[PDB]
Amino acid sequence: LVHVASVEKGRSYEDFQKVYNAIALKLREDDEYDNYIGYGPVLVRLAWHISGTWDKHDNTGGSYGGTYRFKKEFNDPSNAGLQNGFKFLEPIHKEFPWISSGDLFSLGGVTAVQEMQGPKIPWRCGRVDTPEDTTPDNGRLPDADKDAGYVRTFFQRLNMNDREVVALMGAGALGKTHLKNSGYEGPWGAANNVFTNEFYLNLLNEDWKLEKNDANNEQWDSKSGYMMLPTDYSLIQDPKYLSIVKEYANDQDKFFKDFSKAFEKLLENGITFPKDAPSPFIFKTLEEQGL
Ligand code: HEM
Numbered sequence: 001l002v003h004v005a006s007v008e009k010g011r012s013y014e015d016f017q018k019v020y021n022a023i024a025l026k027l028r029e030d031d032e033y034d035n036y037i038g039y040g041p042v043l044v045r046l047a048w049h050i051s052g053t054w055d056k057h058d059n060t061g062g063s064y065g066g067t068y069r070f071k072k073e074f075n076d077p078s079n080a081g082l083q084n085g086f087k088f089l090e091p092i093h094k095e096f097p098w099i100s101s102g103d104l105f106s107l108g109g110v111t112a113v114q115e116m117q118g119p120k121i122p123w124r125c126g127r128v129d130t131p132e133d134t135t136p137d138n139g140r141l142p143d144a145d146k147d148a149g150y151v152r153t154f155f156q157r158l159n160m161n162d163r164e165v166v167a168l169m170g171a172g173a174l175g176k177t178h179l180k181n182s183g184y185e186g187p188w189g190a191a192n193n194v195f196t197n198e199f200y201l202n203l204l205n206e207d208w209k210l211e212k213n214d215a216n217n218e219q220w221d222s223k224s225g226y227m228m229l230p231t232d233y234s235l236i237q238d239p240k241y242l243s244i245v246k247e248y249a250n251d252q253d254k255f256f257k258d259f260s261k262a263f264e265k266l267l268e269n270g271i272t273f274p275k276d277a278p279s280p281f282i283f284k285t286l287e288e289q290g291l
Helices: 013-029 040-051 083-095 101-115 148-156 162-173 198-205 230-236 239-249 252-268
Strands: 208-212 218-222
Touching: 013 040, 013 083, 013 101, 040 083, 040 101, 040 162, 040 252, 083 101, 101 252, 148 162, 148 230, 162 198, 162 230, 162 239, 162 252, 198 230, 198 239, 218 230, 230 239, 239 252
Parallel strands: none
Antiparallel strands: 208 218
């Protein structure tokens, strides 16, 4: 199953920075959403969820085809809440109809992280939309009520290793859980709309109590007001995981660098990039631009 990247006709860096900017700008103006958390975290969750369907064995799923636009992908139950991100991006697609769905959903993710002060994520255009029959089945995303062996094993299908898993899961401690969405409730840290290494810190330095929520799901609760999913918490139960957690808790920059690599890999999984394809783009933020 080969997926060759194909640059949208005649466009180039400038073209994509335009799209970036529009996303960045609307992220700025639409700030009240989710109790003034903003659309940032939902955008990155959406970019991870559309890449997280990839299956390394058969090269099915991944961000290449942009089939989250199909009711089947779109109404996968574990995607709940993501529609808000889809709606966010819709007017932008309208304004830049030439960009492909997959590029728009992945850049959406890149834009958020950089705009929430995370690291720069290099990015590559060229994803090409594919028919609804390519839409993958509900079920290729992970469960939250499992353990480290589950996590390790799940991610093997994505070609992610322990260090990669631990870096991705961190997710800069962005946003929170919503009971109405996942049967879980609460955030991982105090700065839910700033990209940090706070998740490791909290994980290690908080006092967690295993409780049951109003959706009758267990979760780890702290006096501070934070939570952790069982799968989150398992990162300190595993001896390999744990070591990396302490590494990221003690080194801001290492974390930022590791995440940037894994995030990109996650977004590029299954895509074949020709040699005459352009090098990745590194978009500047509004801040760097003065906008
Ligand atoms: C074993 C892996 C993981 C599981 C079980 C999982 C689970 C969860 C669940 C339960 C929520 C709550 C959604 C809702 O209630 O609104 C969610 C939120 C989120 N996750 Fe995942 N996820 C994991 C990994 C990832 C990864 C790899 C990233 C992305 C780099 C990530 C990014 C996010 C973010 C940013 C949100 C917050 C969205 C918002 O606040 O609206 N997730 N995750």
